[PDB]
Amino acid sequence: LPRPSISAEPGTVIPLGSHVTFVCRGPVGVQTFRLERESRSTYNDTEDVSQASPSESEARFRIDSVSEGNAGPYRCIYYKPPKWSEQSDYLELLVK
């Protein structure tokens, strides 16, 4: 149960009305990835997990039509049956 990592495509700075894709990574054997807002506390779960390497699985989350409301810190957590991981480091989305 390593610490998950979070990244953003195309990056942390997003124009208004555009989109961003959050990519969480964990070890193999993840059943669920959660994208969690640290602020506004909304979660996003998926089991749409792909294997990116022998020791790495990932899940992607797209947020569309970003506005000032979606700006803030995001974190990833995974469930590797039967235990939930620690949270990832945060990533702040800036909506310019």
The span from the CA of 60 to the CA of 14, in Å, is: 17
DSSP assignment string, the chain: -PPPEEEEES-SEE-TT--EEEEEEE-TT-SEEEEEETTT--EEEE---EEEETTEEEEEEEE-S--GGG-EEEEEEEEETTEEPPPPPPEEEEE-
What residues does 6 pair with on adjacent strands? 24
Reference 32, options 41, 19, 43; nearest CA is 43
Beta bridge partners of 90: none
In one letter, which amino acid is 42?
Answer: T
Q: How many domains are contained in the chain?
A: 1
Domain harbouring 19, CATH code: 2.60.40.10
Which domain range does residue 1 map to?
Answer: 1-96
